[PDB]
Amino acid sequence: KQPISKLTRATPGSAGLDLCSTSHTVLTPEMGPQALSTGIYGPLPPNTFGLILGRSSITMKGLQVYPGVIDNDYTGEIKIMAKAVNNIVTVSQGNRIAQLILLPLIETDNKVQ
Amino acid sequence: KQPISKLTRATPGSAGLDLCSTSHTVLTPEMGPQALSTGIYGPLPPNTFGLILGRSSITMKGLQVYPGVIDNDYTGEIKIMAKAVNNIVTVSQGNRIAQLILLPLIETDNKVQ
Amino acid sequence: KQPISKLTRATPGSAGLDLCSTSHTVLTPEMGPQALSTGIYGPLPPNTFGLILGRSSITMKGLQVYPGVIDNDYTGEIKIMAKAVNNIVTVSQGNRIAQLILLPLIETDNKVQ
Questions:
Q1: Does domain C1-105 sit in CATH 2.70.40.10?
Q2: Cβ contact, residue pair C73, A5, below 8 Å
Q3: Chain B partners of A109 at a C-beta cutoff of 8 Å?
Q4: Are B5 and B50 in contact (CB under 8 A)?
Q5: CB contact (8 A) between residue C32 and residue A99
């Protein structure tokens, strides 16, 4: 288990922290959404939530990442929800597949239930 | 018609306000995107816009929610744009399908047209 | 090459700046993700990153836009990553296909690598 503070940013202007899967990824179109393990765990900095999105090179190779929302106080593993679009898609362990974007968590008066 | 202030947050750390459909949902892959009615209406708090995203349990069951963007002064019904990915997907009325995330609306000098 | 400052907002409450393709768009489901040229170039205002999302009318016509993330200091062309979902999708040059949403780029202590 590693926290998000261990994640790296490709460059200072990068919106996102890079996410890789811990295992070799073979996905076929008939499989439908698969949850890929990262071994990276919440929680997030105070007053922030996380959004998991694909990288564009990976999207273009036909690996779709479904938007993932990570709550501020989630302490579980961050997974990448991924689907092969058209073709069989393979991603080697340790290749960047997704990115974690941190966004402000706006407070509202909505009830909690 | 109910406003977004009636929506509930699963927990205080939840990024999103829960959205359900008002009707029973049967979706097949051949149907393509369907707009699911929530009976919840804009507008949004000042200086905010809304982003509609799927929940991860629902994504993993093969119901994809296409990112929805809700403008700050939209006064219409918030709908969930949904597609069955691989399999026939059923969702009972009142089961959480999507979430509304509120984000800051940054002001720019871009022209309005 | 035009900068994002030339983009227009449909209304003052619009979250997003409108994006069109520079060419006629014919997309079939078997083609998988295609990168549509906009002729609009980064970079983004300081302390912001960009998120590219589809418009909802276009989503509903069966043209899916994959979430695109634009880094703050990206100076290349903003492209729209698009896929025909179910049906052959045509979009005429100059019809709005996507939108660029500007979001705050939160600073973290994460390493840069």
A1: yes
A2: no
A3: 5
A4: no
A5: no
Task: Find, in chain B, the residue whose alpha carbon is nearest to that of C15.
Answer: B71
For strands C68-70 and C8-9, give the pairing: unpaired
Give resolution in angstroms: 1.9
Which residues 66-105 in chain A show a CB within 8 A of chain B?
Answer: 66-74, 81, 83, 103-105
Q: Measured between CB atoms, which of B50, B69, B71 is closest to C53?
A: B69
Q: How far apart are CA A28 and CA A12, in angstroms?
A: 35
Q: How far is CA C99 from the centre of its chain?
A: 5
C13: which chain B residues are within 8 Å (Cβ-Cβ)? 71-74, 105
How far is A67 from A96, CA to CA, in rounded Å? 16
CA B42 to chain CA centroid, Å, is 12
Helix (H, G, I), strand (E, B) or coil at B59: helix
User: Parallel, antiparallel, or unpaired for β A77-84 and A34-41?
Assistant: antiparallel
Residue A5 to residues A44, A77, A81, Cα–Cα distance (Å) = 9, 14, 21
Altogether, the residues listed in chain C come to a count of: 113
Task: Give ∠ CA C1-B110-C54 in degrees, rounded to 5.
Answer: 75
Contact B26, B45 (CB under 8 A): no
Rounded Cα distance, C104 and C44, in Å:
11
Return the domain boundaries, chain B.
Answer: 1-105
Interface contact flag, B104 A109, Cβ < 8 Å: no
DSSP letters spanning B39-55: EEE----TTEEEEEEE-
Contact A85 C35 (CB under 8 A): no
Interfacial A residues in 15-34 facing C (CB < 8 Å) = 15-17
* Chains with ≥3 CB–CB distances under 8 Å to C: A, B
* Contact of A14 with C74, CB cutoff 8 Å: no
